[PDB]
Amino acid sequence: QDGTFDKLTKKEALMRTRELEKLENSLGGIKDMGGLPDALFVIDADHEHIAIKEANNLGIPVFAIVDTNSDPDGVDFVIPGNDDAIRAVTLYLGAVAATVREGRS
Amino acid sequence: ELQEKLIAVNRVSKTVKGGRIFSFTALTVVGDGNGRVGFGYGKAREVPAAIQKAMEKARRNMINVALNNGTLQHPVKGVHTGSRVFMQPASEGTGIIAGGAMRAVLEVAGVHNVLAKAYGSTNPINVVRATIDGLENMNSPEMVAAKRGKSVEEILG
Amino acid sequence: MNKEILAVVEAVSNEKALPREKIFEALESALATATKKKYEQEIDVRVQIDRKSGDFDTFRRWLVVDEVTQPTKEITLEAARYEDESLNLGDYVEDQIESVTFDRITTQTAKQVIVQKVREAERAMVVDQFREHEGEIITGVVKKVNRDNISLDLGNNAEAVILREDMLPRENFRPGDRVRGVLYSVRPEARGAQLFVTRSKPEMLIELFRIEVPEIGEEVIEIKAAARDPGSRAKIAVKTNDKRIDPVGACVGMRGARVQAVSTELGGERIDIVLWDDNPAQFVINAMAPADVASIVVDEDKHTMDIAVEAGNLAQAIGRNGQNVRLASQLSGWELNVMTVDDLQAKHQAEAHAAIDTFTKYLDIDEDFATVLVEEGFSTLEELAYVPMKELLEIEGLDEPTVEALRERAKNALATIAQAQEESLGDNKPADDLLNLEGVDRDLAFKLAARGVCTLEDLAEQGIDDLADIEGLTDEKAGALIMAARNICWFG
Amino acid sequence: TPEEKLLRAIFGEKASDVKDSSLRVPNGVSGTVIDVQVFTRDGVEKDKRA
Amino acid sequence: DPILLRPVDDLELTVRSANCLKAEAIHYIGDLVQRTEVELLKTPNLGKKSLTEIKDVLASRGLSLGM
Numbered sequence A: 001q002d003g004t005f006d007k008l009t010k011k012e013a014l015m016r017t018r019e020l021e022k023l024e025n026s027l028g029g030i031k032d033m034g035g036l037p038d039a040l041f042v043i044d045a046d047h048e049h050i051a052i053k054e055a056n057n058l059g060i061p062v063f064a065i066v067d068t069n070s071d072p073d074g075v076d077f078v079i080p081g082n083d084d085a086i087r088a089v090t091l092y093l094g095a096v097a098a099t100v101r102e103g104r105s
Numbered sequence B: 001e002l003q004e005k006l007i008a009v010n011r012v013s014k015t016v017k018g019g020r021i022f023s024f025t026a027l028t029v030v031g032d033g034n035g036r037v038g039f040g041y042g043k044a045r046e047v048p049a050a051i052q053k054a055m056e057k058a059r060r061n062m063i064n065v066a067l068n069n070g071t072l073q074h075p076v077k078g079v080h081t082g083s084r085v086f087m088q089p090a091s092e093g094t095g096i097i098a099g100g101a102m103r104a105v106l107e108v109a110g111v112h113n114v115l116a117k118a119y120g121s122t123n124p125i126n127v128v129r130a131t132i133d134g135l136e137n138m139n140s141p142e143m144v145a146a147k148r149g150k151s152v153e154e155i156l157g
Numbered sequence C: 001m002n003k004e005i006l007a008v009v010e011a012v013s014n015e016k017a018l019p020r021e022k023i024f025e026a027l028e029s030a031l032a033t034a035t036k037k038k039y040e041q042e043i044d045v046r047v048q049i050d051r052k053s054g055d056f057d058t059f060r061r062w063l064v065v066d067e068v069t070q071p072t073k074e075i076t077l078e079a080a081r082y083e084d085e086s087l088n089l090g091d092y093v094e095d096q097i098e099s100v101t102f103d104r105i106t107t108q109t110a111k112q113v114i115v116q117k118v119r120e121a122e123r124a125m126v127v128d129q130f131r132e133h134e135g136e137i138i139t140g141v142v143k144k145v146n147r148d149n150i151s152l153d154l155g156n157n158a159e160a161v162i163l164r165e166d167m168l169p170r171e172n173f174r175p176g177d178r179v180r181g182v183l184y185s186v187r188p189e190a191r192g193a194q195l196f197v198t199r200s201k202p203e204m205l206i207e208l209f210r211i212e213v214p215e216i217g218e219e220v221i222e223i224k225a226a227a228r229d230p231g232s233r234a235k236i237a238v239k240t241n242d243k244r245i246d247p248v249g250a251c252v253g254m255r256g257a258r259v260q261a262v263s264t265e266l267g268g269e270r271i272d273i274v275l276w277d278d279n280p281a282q283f284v285i286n287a288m289a290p291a292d293v294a295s296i297v298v299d300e301d302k303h304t305m306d307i308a309v310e311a312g313n314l315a316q317a318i319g320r321n322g323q324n325v326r327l328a329s330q331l332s333g334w335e336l337n338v339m340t341v342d343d344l345q346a347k348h349q350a351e352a353h354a355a356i357d358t359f360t361k362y363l364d365i366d367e368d369f370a371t372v373l374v375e376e377g378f379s380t381l382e383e384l385a386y387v388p389m390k391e392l393l394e395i396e397g398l399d400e401p402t403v404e405a406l407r408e409r410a411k412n413a414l415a416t417i418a419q420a421q422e423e424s425l426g427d428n429k430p431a432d433d434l435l436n437l438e439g440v441d442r443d444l445a446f447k448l449a450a451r452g453v454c455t456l457e458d459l460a461e462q463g464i465d466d467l468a469d470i471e472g473l474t475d476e477k478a479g480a481l482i483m484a485a486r487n488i489c490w491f492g
Numbered sequence D: 001t002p003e004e005k006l007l008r009a010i011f012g013e014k015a016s017d018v019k020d021s022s023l024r025v026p027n028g029v030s031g032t033v034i035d036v037q038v039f040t041r042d043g044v045e046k047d048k049r050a
Numbered sequence E: 001d002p003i004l005l006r007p008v009d010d011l012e013l014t015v016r017s018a019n020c021l022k023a024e025a026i027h028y029i030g031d032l033v034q035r036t037e038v039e040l041l042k043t044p045n046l047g048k049k050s051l052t053e054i055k056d057v058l059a060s061r062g063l064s065l066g067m
Helices: A008-027 A049-055 A086-103 B045-058 B104-108 B124-136 B141-145 C002-016 C021-035 C077-083 C105-119 C122-131 C202-212 C248-252 C252-265 C280-287 C314-318 C321-334 C341-362 C367-375 C381-386 C389-393 C401-427 C442-450 C456-460 C476-489 D003-012 E015-023 E028-036 E046-058
Strands: A040-042 A060-065 B005-015 B020-031 B036-040 B084-089 B115-120 C046-049 C057-060 C060-063 C074-077 C137-145 C148-156 C159-162 C177-186 C195-198 C221-229 C234-238 C269-274 C295-300 C302-309 C334-338
Touching: A008 C476, A040 A049, A049 A060, A086 B005, B005 B045, B005 B104, B005 B124, B020 B124, B036 B104, B036 B124, B045 C159, B045 C314, B084 B124, B084 C221, B104 B124, B124 C234, B141 C314, C002 C021, C002 C177, C021 C046, C021 C057, C021 C202, C057 C195, C057 C280, C060 C077, C074 C077, C074 C476, C105 D003, C122 C159, C122 C202, C137 C159, C148 C177, C148 C195, C148 C202, C177 C202, C202 C221, C202 C234, C202 C248, C202 C252, C221 C248, C221 E015, C234 C248, C252 C269, C269 C280, C280 C295, C280 C302, C280 C321, C295 C341, C302 C341, C314 C321, C314 C334, C314 E028, C321 C334, C334 C341, C334 E028, C381 C401, C389 C401, C401 C442, C456 C476, D003 E046, E015 E046, E028 E046
Parallel strands: A040 A060, C060 C074, C159 C195, C234 C269, C302 C334
Antiparallel strands: B005 B020, B020 B036, B084 B115, C046 C057, C137 C148, C137 C177, C148 C159, C177 C195, C221 C234, C295 C302
């Protein structure tokens, strides 16, 4: 973001900014956190089934928007509802954002 | 404090085009002596790193068991994959009279009086898994009272 | 000569990682100052060094200003523009002046200014790169021991200071000893010691645990609070989000090895490690360790907690000179009152009797009905006056008319409390004798009388500190009123 | 010393080990300088006071 | 006199009197001895009782206010 983006090798400087942006999305908003989370709000139980199995290895209460094809056993606070329509996801994301704003008093 | 306890090391192998490579597996167990106990398997290419990696997962694997005064609650079975451990509480049985790999897991759990004997293939890692599920389903009268009858007294007199 | 300037600029730029421009600006200022000292008159001087040759021209600078205060160093914009129309306010007019010969005098001045520029560039960038160290446990060598402070050498011409209050009470350092401490403040005393290092504050304990406990450095375990009596005893409160990790066991380590390493670095300070709880009562029970707590009563309004202990545990709960209760109170943020179970019951009986007497006296109710109000949790006339009508209607035997009458009586009792004080010395004597004190409105007189300051003599006896909590009274206004009261009472 | 090159740091020349020293005169008499003569062997650069 | 160079805390004053003197930047016994009784009575949190304590303590060391 400032400094060695030119200093030694221009092609290899394009390697690092090719390294950067793939790491930018995979490790997105996790770098601001540090340490383990306290809860975990999932929007699809079936698709992200690794994390629910991963979070239940530790002591993390999770929050899954579940569709009818998945299995609601590892999730603690199960939420039934559609999750493949875009307008459906903005309900749950808009609710979980505005409520946690009220919770950060 | 944690009172760690080793049971058995082993020399396992696997082969490649160059030859065969050994390693070591070492089943251990840890336990507080007052109702917490946990085992962990662990395996590595050298016995100091094998037993240390065994304990490090045994710390996270601890389970709570509810007992009375150094002995069990009731008789309880223990079946797991060719290892039928029997456990009888034996109120002041004057020592833990059990076989190998049960004498470890019962001691660090904190009991001192149980009579026990393993029926079947006396294999060490499969028999310490046999006592654990046999101990974690064994229930105190408190849990029995608060699901059934709803008096702590009359359920055992 | 010429190529030597370039070789010096390149050597210094590479060795001190400093912009060549900043070194030249400083050499120009150094040479200007050395030139000014050769003239008997106070002149203004600009020096310009050529960046390719190392040659330098010296001027009689004339700071272009709007109004000339110093005719020897300043020129008006109108006069400057007569020589060069391109000049603006803040520019310099020059005058062909003989450049000072670079003798060992100018050489020494140039060396001093370069060293000072390196302190504000190389050393400043080193401190910026060591952002962790500025906050973590820096290591220094004791250069000098004075009565009131210890000077540490950190290397690279950086000096730090440990103040006497920042040392442990039993530490004795000698010149040449290595000392660790937290860099808790960076000020601007470049010449001398700008760095302030502590060994006594709680941050030293936190950072020692961060280094000794990997799980704290990895943010798996968090230190929520630390309370410390330096060189004697500390308490730390630890939390983890990972249910597989015991945070107390991790900080203690195998057979206490980790906590003993921290204790040894702190001169044998005893460290208690407690589990942080989000419930204040459970957290205080944990903080009181090693004393067993029998019961806790929480007063949320006073931000206080009464802690009952068994009579055998009382001495352990208080600790030597109150050290255990004080460290628990500092760790929780609550005021902690440690008493026996029998003393807590006697206190509650005395409070219940005082509440019954207050309600019987002011509400014109019988003792039986006053007892019911106290058993339902009412202790003050304010609670009865202001609590939601629904809570008073939940009490067995209260109807809506009786609750309204009880609230009206409680409000009238509260009013009469202030009204009697006013009639005696509030809207009467405090609004006359104490009103004489410069700046004493009727509202302030009633606020003073609510603290028991009813007369002009009572106000003359106060300190500024006794009045500091009165809403609308600044320390200056309090001081003025106390002095006005003293002038009338003691010097009238 | 390496510091004998401090001169070089602002100027240059060779080394500073050479004893820098200005021929200063002794005491015992006051006075008022009334007349100064300067004689120059021919070829030598006349300075500004000559 | 080496007594003037001592801090005011060495006078064994009440915690109130010492904190009132520190609030007025009086650090040494030599600073205290120069102040008049009328000046000390203007200081914040300085009562007639604390002034009598300061006089009695200064008198025990052979010092007086206003030197």
